[PDB]
Design an enzyme around this catalytic site. Structure first.
Site, PDB file in Angstrom:
ATOM      1  N   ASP A 108       0.482  -0.961   0.263  1.00  0.00           N
ATOM      2  CA  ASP A 108      -0.134   0.536  -0.081  1.00  0.00           C
ATOM      3  C   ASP A 108       0.814   1.249   0.054  1.00  0.00           C
ATOM      4  OD1 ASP A 108       0.918   0.405   2.093  1.00  0.00           O
ATOM      5  OD2 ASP A 108      -1.052  -0.371   3.612  1.00  0.00           O
TER       6      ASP A 108
ATOM      7  N   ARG B  36       0.571   7.566   0.095  1.00  0.00           N
ATOM      8  CA  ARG B  36       0.233   5.533   0.910  1.00  0.00           C
ATOM      9  C   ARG B  36      -1.349   5.620   0.392  1.00  0.00           C
ATOM     10  NH1 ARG B  36      -3.121   2.690   3.218  1.00  0.00           N
ATOM     11  NH2 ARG B  36      -2.683   1.905   5.285  1.00  0.00           N
TER      12      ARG B  36
ATOM     13  N   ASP C  72      -5.873  -1.304   3.748  1.00  0.00           N
ATOM     14  CA  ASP C  72      -4.672  -1.681   4.653  1.00  0.00           C
ATOM     15  C   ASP C  72      -3.939  -2.597   4.390  1.00  0.00           C
ATOM     16  OD1 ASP C  72      -2.891  -1.392   6.977  1.00  0.00           O
ATOM     17  OD2 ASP C  72      -4.103  -2.183   7.588  1.00  0.00           O
ATOM     18  N   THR C  73      -2.717  -3.174   3.070  1.00  0.00           N
ATOM     19  CA  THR C  73      -2.699  -4.307   3.504  1.00  0.00           C
ATOM     20  C   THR C  73      -1.278  -4.705   4.403  1.00  0.00           C
ATOM     21  OG1 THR C  73      -0.234  -2.524   2.227  1.00  0.00           O
ATOM     22  CG2 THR C  73      -2.174  -4.123   0.495  1.00  0.00           C
TER      23      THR C  73
ATOM     24  N   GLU D 264       1.966  -6.188   6.514  1.00  0.00           N
ATOM     25  CA  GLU D 264       2.918  -5.140   6.267  1.00  0.00           C
ATOM     26  C   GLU D 264       4.074  -6.318   5.398  1.00  0.00           C
ATOM     27  OE1 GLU D 264       3.749  -2.492   6.852  1.00  0.00           O
ATOM     28  OE2 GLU D 264       2.846  -2.226   7.801  1.00  0.00           O
TER      29      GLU D 264
ATOM     30  N   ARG E 162       4.109  11.530   3.655  1.00  0.00           N
ATOM     31  CA  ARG E 162       3.519  10.303   2.512  1.00  0.00           C
ATOM     32  C   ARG E 162       1.873  11.276   2.042  1.00  0.00           C
ATOM     33  NH1 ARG E 162       2.692   4.455   5.421  1.00  0.00           N
ATOM     34  NH2 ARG E 162       1.260   5.890   6.502  1.00  0.00           N
TER      35      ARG E 162
END
Ligand SMILES: Cc1cn([C@H]2C[C@H](OP(=O)(O)O)[C@@H](COP(=O)(O)O)O2)c(=O)[nH]c1=O
Ligand SMILES: [Ca+2]
Length: 129
Positions: free
Chosen positions: A15, A29, A34-35, A37, A75
């Site tokens: 992401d 971002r 939400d991907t 980690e 970001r």
């Protein structure tokens, strides 16, 4: 909203990506997702998925929403398009991201992404398996 040009500098993870925007290097971002980690389950797959989208694209575009354009880490906060396909939505549709971080005022594509998530869940894809 409207799309604006950018060019790939480098993939980062599911992401986040480094793009050149208005001639300046920036980390973006992806809004409303939400991907995992890289070190978490489906992280590598999410990273690969996003990486392939950027690298195969003839044309990358960024689309800011109505609110905050940068987060507290500097970001950029945008929807990212690869040859017209929204990466944010593609990630969710494939069960490689969850809808997340939905803040008032940067939520134009919320319902679109929720619809993708519902479909990924039905199909039991990846994160929903
Ligand atoms: C996606 C997004 C994240 N963020 C901030 C909230 C989180 O703060 P914390 O770092 O304090 O948890 C962090 C999550 O990003 P990551 O999921 O990339 O870690 O980024 C925003 O402020 N606005 C946003 O639209
Ligand atoms: Ca993440």
């Amino acid at each position: 909203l409207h799309k604006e040009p950018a060019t790939l500098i480098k993939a980062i993870d599911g992401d986040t990506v480094k793009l050149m925007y208005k001639g300046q290097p920036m980390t973006f971002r992806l809004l409303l997702v939400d991907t995992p980690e890289f070190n978490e389950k489906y992280g590598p797959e999410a990273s690969a998925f996003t990486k392939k989208m950027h690298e195969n694209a003839k044309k990358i575009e960024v689309e800011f929403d109505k609110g905050q354009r940068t987060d507290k880490y500097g970001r950029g906060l945008a929807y990212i398009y690869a040859d017209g396909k929204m990466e944010n939505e593609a990630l969710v549709r494939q069960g490689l991201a969850k809808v997340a971080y939905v803040y008032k005022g940067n939520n134009t594509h919320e319902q679109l992404l929720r619809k993708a998530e519902a479909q990924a869940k039905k199909e039991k894809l990846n994160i929903w398996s």
